[PDB]
Design a protein around this ligand. Structure first.
Ligand SMILES: CC(C)(COP(=O)(O)OP(=O)(O)OC[C@H]1O[C@@H](n2cnc3c(N)ncnc32)[C@H](O)[C@@H]1OP(=O)(O)O)[C@@H](O)C(=O)NCCC(=O)NCCS
Ligand SMILES: O=P(O)(O)O[C@H]1[C@@H](OP(=O)(O)O)[C@@H](OP(=O)(O)O)[C@@H](OP(=O)(O)O)[C@@H](OP(=O)(O)O)[C@H]1OP(=O)(O)O
Length: 336
């Protein structure tokens, strides 16, 4: 019974519980309906950017509780604090990296890093020796691979010049609004490959990345690591939600050994699973005009739905202090 754990607040708790599940499940029902009807959300006038920003802090709480040791913390870069450049304010509970590095208790963390307009995933190690970070970006649209040099340097400068850093840009995202669900999934995959990421942190502080990645280079300015080929650290299980079939196939062509390993309990290969998620629909054009018809994997929209399902279930059976916390995180999203 929960009457013992309610501290006489069963009225406020029970009402905040309904309020949070109502929003999570309310978003779930529309997204499930749009996905089942094979319709693009932004063409259907669903404001995914705002829903993804409001549910994210609540998803992390659920994921942190579902997998202890994930230690997933939302963080943002300095440019995210600038109301002039940013397209959206950082999500509720988000911390400035400088504040985090200075005050975070030593240990292992996962993170989603908002720069104001885009979000990446990260694996952070903080101890006496220093802080080290492995950043995986689900977007790779830069035409010339020199912006990644800047990104790697820009990420290192945000964590401190004494931090060891690796920047891994990966061709997963194709849409404009999926960078939050993709980064959240990469974080979960990081905790899944915890051992492999710890051995990379070790090599970062000490030799040859060849035991961990296929292609890497130190940057001229800060000597941070830029990885333009993350395999095998970036394996098939990290490429599952690649939206373009050409990205998954190019990746498998470059790393054939990843084409036969199981990516889930159903024993699907990366290629089998992506094919199962291929849909054909109209999307917004980013000549002429407005829309274009494409064939892509709806894995991310299915994953957004599956994550909302998890969170809504967690809250239904969550203890009051968790309910209070998630209700506040939702209210805090209407600030800024
Ligand atoms: C390559 C890129 C720059 C544009 O692609 P393009 O040259 O114009 O060619 P297309 O628009 O026909 O699409 C390219 C591929 O990505 C897919 N794609 C394009 N836009 C997509 C979208 N909004 N959602 C899901 N998939 C998309 C397409 O299905 C296509 O896959 P395919 O090669 O397996 O057939 C793409 O990476 C992109 O749109 N990046 C923007 C990311 C962002 O907005 N931030
Ligand atoms: O990474 P998680 O969020 O922790 O969930 C993953 C995973 O999800 P991803 O697609 O993002 O990698 C699988 O999902 P699918 O391949 O089917 O899409 C899987 O499912 P199955 O093995 O049953 O096929 C199962 O999730 P669940 O048990 O809730 O259905 C699994 O969980 P774990 O990695 O924690 O074991």
């Amino acid at each position: 019974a929960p009457a013992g754990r309610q501290a006489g607040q069963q009225a406020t708790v029970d009402r905040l519980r309904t309020q949070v599940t109502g929003f999570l499940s309310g978003a779930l029902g529309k997204l499930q309906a749009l996905s089942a009807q094979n319709m693009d959300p932004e063409l259907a006038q669903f404001r995914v950017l705002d829903v993804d920003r409001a549910i994210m802090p609540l998803l992390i709480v659920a994921e942190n509780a579902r997998n202890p040791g994930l230690n997933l913390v939302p963080l943002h870069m300095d440019m995210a604090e600038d109301e002039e450049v940013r397209t959206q304010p950082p999500m509720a509970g988000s911390r400035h990296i400088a504040e985090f590095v200075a005050s975070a208790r030593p240990g292992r963390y996962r993170a989603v890093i908002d720069d104001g307009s885009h979000t990446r995933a990260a694996d952070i190690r903080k101890d006496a020796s220093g802080t080290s970070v492995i950043v995986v970006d689900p977007l790779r649209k830069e035409k010339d691979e020199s912006a990644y040099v800047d990104y790697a340097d820009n990420v290192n400068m945000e964590f401190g010049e004494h931090a060891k850093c690796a920047f891994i840009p990966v061709d997963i995202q194709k849409s404009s609004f999926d960078c939050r669900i993709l980064s959240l999934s990469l974080a979960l995959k990081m905790h899944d490959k915890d051992d492999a990421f710890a051995a990379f942190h070790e090599t970062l502080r000490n030799g040859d990345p060849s035991h961990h990645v296929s292609r890497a280079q130190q940057t001229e300015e800060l000597g941070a690591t830029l990885v333009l080929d993350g395999a095998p650290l970036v394996d098939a299980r990290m490429m599952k939600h690649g939206q373009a079939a050409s990205s998954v196939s190019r990746y498998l062509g470059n790393h054939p050994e990843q084409s036969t390993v199981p990516v889930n309990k159903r024993n699907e290969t990366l290629g089998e699973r992506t094919t199962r998620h291929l849909v054909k629909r109209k999307v917004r054009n980013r000549t002429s005009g407005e829309t274009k018809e494409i064939t892509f994997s709806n894995s991310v929209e299915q994953k957004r739905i599956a994550l909302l399902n998890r969170a809504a279930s967690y809250v239904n059976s969550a203890p009051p202090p968790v309910v209070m916390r998630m209700a506040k995180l939702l209210q805090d999203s209407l600030l800024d």
